[PDB]
Each structure stands twice: as structure tokens, then as C-alpha cells.
Amino acid sequence: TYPLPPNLPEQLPLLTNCQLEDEAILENHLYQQIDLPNQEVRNLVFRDAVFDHLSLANGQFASFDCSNVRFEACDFSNVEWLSGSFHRVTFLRCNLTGTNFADSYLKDCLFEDCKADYASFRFANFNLVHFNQTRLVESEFFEVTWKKLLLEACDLTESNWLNTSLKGLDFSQNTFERLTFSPNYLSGLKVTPEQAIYLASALGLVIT
């Protein structure tokens, strides 16, 4: 089962500028080429919309609510989305470098061809979340609660999976040269022989 895509019509009216205010709702448009760096805005609602080349770089968005939205080629580098809510959201070709989603709720979300090195999902709750062709080097998947999590064609090198169940995940279609994990949460992970050898070494086997 794949995440549901955002519920969008074929045609949405185009806007090339927007303003952010606390409790503001941005909805029902295609928002294109907007550069709003270093903002701090509470209780934002983005819904039923597409954002194309939006930058919120170094933004801080408390109690963020996002539903039925596709973000395309957006810059969210270092953004704080602590305890955010994301439902039927796609991040496509987005810069998520250092983006902080700690404590967020993600349901029916897709990350496709994103740069997400150092991104944090610490304590996140996932339900139908798919990472596809997304770079996740030194990312944080610490104590994540999840159902129907899929990762394919992702670079997971040095990602942190401590306190997160790996039972029923398939890392065989991803790459990692290093991985941090909890030994008691390892059983049931699907891997290649090369990955198995790495994991066995990480568990303390001395392999010739």
C-alpha cells in the first residue's frame, strides 16, 4: 500500500507571491517562486495546494498543519516543524537538509528524490510514509513509531535508528555504509548479504 497522494484538481489558480501570518491558511492555489527565508510563524495551515520553488529556509513553524499538498523543488533547509501534522503530503525534489520534524505526525506522506541529510524524525509517528530516492545521510529516525514505512533507493549511511523497530522494513533496496540501531529491534529487517555482514560486525562479531 502506497501513501495516498495529495487530493488535488488538475488545474489550480496561480499565485507568485504570498504572505505568512500566524493562523494564516494558504489553500486552493499553485504558489510559485516565493522566497520567504528566516520566518517565525505559528499555527500555519497549508492545504489543498501545490508549492513550486517556495523557500522557507531557516524558518520556524510551531503547530504547523499540512494536508493534501505537494511541495515541488522547495527549500526547507534547517526548517523547524516540531510536532507538525502532515496528511496526504508529497515532498518532491525538495531540499530537506537539516529539516527538523521531531515529534510530528505523518500520515500518507511521500518523500521523492529529496536531499534530506541531517533531517530529523526523532519521536515522529509515521503511518503510510514512503521515502523514495531520498538522501538520508546522518538523518535521525530515533524512537520512531511507525506503520507501513517504506524506504527505497535511499542513502541511509550514518542514520540513527536507535529505539525504532526494524522488524518488517526492507533496507535491501537502500544503501548504508554505517548504521546506528538497537540490537533488540533488529530481527525481521530485510537486507543484502553485504548489509548483513556489516550488521553482524556492528553486533560485535569479528569477521575475517
Where do contacts with a copy of itself occur on this chain (CB under 8 A)? 167, 172, 183, 186-193, 196-197, 199-201, 203-208
Q: Which three cell numbers stand for residue 32?
A: 510559485
Q: Which is nearer to Cl ion, 60 or 132 (CB)?
A: 132
| Residue 28, phi-psi category: left (phi > 0), alpha (psi -120 to 50), beta (remainder) | left
Q: Binding residues for Cl ion, how many (CB under 5 A)?
A: 11
151 makes contact with Cl ion (CB under 5 A): yes
> Residues before each break in the chain (C–N > 2.5 Å)?
none
From a copy of itself, Cl ion, none, which one binds at residue 49 (CB under 5 to 8 Å depending on kind)? none
Q: Which three cell numbers stand for residue 8?
A: 488535488
* CA dihedral for 114, 111, 17, 46, sign (positive or negative): negative
Q: Which is nearer to a copy of itself, 13 or 204 (CB)?
A: 204
Q: Which is nearer to Cl ion, 63 or 145 (CB)?
A: 145
Least Cβ distance, residue 35 to a copy of itself (angstroms): 45
Least Cβ distance, residue 150 to a copy of itself (angstroms): 15
| Residue 162 three-state SS | coil
The conformation of residue 5, written as its DSSP 8-state character, comes to: P
90 makes contact with Cl ion (CB under 5 A): yes
Least Cβ distance, residue 162 to Cl ion (angstroms): 8
Q: Which three cell numbers stand for residue 25?
A: 491558511
